[PDB]
Design an enzyme around this catalytic site. Structure first.
Site, mmCIF file in Angstrom:
data_model
loop_
_atom_site.group_PDB
_atom_site.id
_atom_site.type_symbol
_atom_site.label_atom_id
_atom_site.label_comp_id
_atom_site.label_asym_id
_atom_site.label_seq_id
_atom_site.Cartn_x
_atom_site.Cartn_y
_atom_site.Cartn_z
ATOM 1 C CE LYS B 53 -10.713 1.375 8.581
ATOM 2 N NZ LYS B 53 -9.310 1.862 8.458
HETATM 3 C C1 LIG Z 1 -9.230 1.573 7.179
HETATM 4 C C2 LIG Z 1 -9.027 2.373 5.969
HETATM 5 C C3 LIG Z 1 -9.128 1.889 4.644
HETATM 6 C C4 LIG Z 1 -9.457 0.466 4.317
HETATM 7 O O1 LIG Z 1 -10.843 0.141 4.640
HETATM 8 P P1 LIG Z 1 -11.108 -1.343 5.319
HETATM 9 O O2 LIG Z 1 -12.579 -1.447 5.517
HETATM 10 O O3 LIG Z 1 -10.311 -1.341 6.623
HETATM 11 O O4 LIG Z 1 -10.557 -2.282 4.281
HETATM 12 C C5 LIG Z 1 -8.917 2.761 3.603
HETATM 13 N N1 LIG Z 1 -8.605 4.052 3.785
HETATM 14 C C6 LIG Z 1 -8.500 4.539 5.023
HETATM 15 C C7 LIG Z 1 -8.152 5.983 5.200
HETATM 16 C C8 LIG Z 1 -8.707 3.729 6.138
HETATM 17 O O5 LIG Z 1 -8.589 4.279 7.360
#
Ligand SMILES: *Cc1c(COP(=O)(O)O)cnc(C)c1O
Ligand SMILES: *Cc1c(COP(=O)(O)O)cnc(C)c1O
Lengths: 288, 319
Positions: B53
């Site tokens: 993120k």
């Molecule tokens: C946010 C997140 C996802 C999904 O990724 P996106 O780009 O938001 O679709 C998957 N795993 C974790 C641990 C996340 O924090």
């Protein structure tokens, strides 16, 4: 090893987690310390078990293998509730060594989660004088006794983190050389706390060879000199490191940052001094 | 940005935590998967808040600054209990933006620790239909209402992670290009779960431009496969941060081949195996991604010598 590596982590493929160990960023804390001089620190929280112990763990296992002391597929044992457990767990996982850890029932269960997740056999040893949340010297002596008994029964290799000289060698061959290169030789002091002392002794030994005028300080809670730090100072600078630099690190990092800022304010060093410390581990490895 | 950077993290000095974002290792899981073919994965847990993120957080803040929408020293607000909060908290700390977070009192207090530690101003909002440990859609809607009310008073920039197109752009300009370079163009398939969808849509779009024969798969929890078009029978799963019951608003079907379903039991098994075989403690979505990638290698749908790339999304320490 981390010294002979042809691995390109940026533009290539990383063969294993072992190649994620060392060659950590040296970050400028230019917002926390806007001047005069510069505060820099090794991001040891970006090692694969999120502590500087990946380095000493890797060396102590690898060197036992090279010496013949540890044979392919054979068992390793250490007494620890700390970052050394996670580091050995990660190294032994990749190299295919069964790993047993002893620690006191006194520890929060949280202290075994990473070790267990990386395939450690965690033996919880009954407290002798302590209560939940308070692991005493006699609680630790008992964990030691359990590991010695298992070692005699199995002939597991005992890592012996506090007495294994390959602990300091790790930092002499990796941490110190990295800092020297990353600063292009511009460094007036180094400082870090001591548990085993590997980080301080190894890194300081190497830096004083490149430049004997580099002032090396031990951070002591409540060799050129020591800087003393309170728990209140550790907590304050742990928070400031987060608020100003966006890095959530542990309490020993708070202490290192607080000592380094006292050292920058002291005038013991040139006005334009570059001071290097260690961001030892992630704040995620602590409860609450 | 992470695209124009002359920063040498190995042999030079890292100016700030922003420069710790992206250019993550692509690791070979050659012990977990000894062949035939190869399993590769981006170590997104080595971003400075230990999740992928950091990329989407960095882009959404940086692009609001570039657009003029976010002025120097002005306030940011997001509704989040998750990895997005930590990422924005880290970015806003470096750039000197006051950051306010709303989340339901329903969440474990543990969900606020990193965000708070990186200077996030955390507002806890009373549940409406949920109980401690059970955050409902009505509980979330209330946190949103509190952030909008605060935003009216302060005029903070609303990150709006589920609707911000710079979410996908992050992965189109960093994650995808990194994988393409790090494999030197050898990749037969890419796969990851969807929360916001940024990672899948951005990465897949870039990879299919370099090579349209690359098969891109969404990892879906069994019984919660909206993107595959399947009916939702099981809304509750362990793949935290992904597997929302809706086709994400940022989703682009034109870079989508198919879905790979995973059970909770498979996520758990491959989370453990990743730790025992490779020494990497990652979260539940990483368990799921590894289990889908191994299922895809075993299926025979791909050539025997196929190189399959996934994401190690976050650290196991964030749970
Ligand atoms: C946010 C997140 C996802 C999904 O990724 P996106 O780009 O938001 O679709 C998957 N795993 C974790 C641990 C996340 O924090
Ligand atoms: C081990 C450790 C230290 C001290 O390192 P040594 O090289 O053993 O002196 C400091 N902080 C943390 C968090 C550690 O795990």
């Amino acid at each position: 090893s981390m010294t002979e590596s042809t691995v390109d982590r940026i533009n290539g493929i990383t063969p294993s987690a072992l190649d994620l160990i060392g060659n950590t960023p040296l970050i400028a804390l230019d917002r926390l310390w806007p001047g005069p001089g510069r505060l820099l620190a090794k991001c040891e929280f970006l090692n694969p078990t999120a502590s500087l112990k990946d380095r000493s763990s890797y060396y102590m296992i690898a060197k036992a293998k090279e010496s013949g002391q540890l044979k392919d597929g054979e068992s390793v044992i250490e007494v620890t509730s700390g970052n050394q457990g996670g580091g050995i767990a990660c190294v032994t996982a990749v190299m295919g060594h069964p790993f047993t850890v002893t620690m006191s029932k006194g520890n929060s269960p949280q202290r075994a989660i990473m070790m267990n997740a990386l395939g450690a056999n965690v033996i919880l040893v009954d407290q002798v004088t302590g209560k939940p949340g308070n692991v005493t010297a006699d609680d630790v002596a008992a964990a030691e006794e359990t590991a010695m008994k298992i070692r005699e029964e199995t002939n597991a290799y005992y890592v012996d983190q506090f007495n294994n000289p390959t602990n300091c060698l790790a930092h002499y061959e990796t941490t110190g050389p990295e800092i020297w290169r990353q600063t292009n030789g511009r460094i007036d002091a180094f400082l870090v706390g001591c548990g085993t002392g590997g980080c301080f002794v190894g890194t300081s030994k190497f830096l004083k060879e490149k430049n004997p005028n580099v002032r090396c300080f031990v951070v002591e809670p409540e060799y050129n000199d020591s800087i003393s730090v309170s728990d209140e100072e550790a907590i304050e600078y742990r928070k400031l490191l987060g608020q100003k630099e966006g890095l959530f690190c542990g309490f020993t990092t708070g202490g290192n940052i607080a000592a380094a800022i006292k050292l920058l304010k002291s005038g013991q060093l040139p006005k334009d001094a570059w001071v290097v410390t260690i961001l030892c581990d992630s704040g995620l490895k602590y409860p609450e």
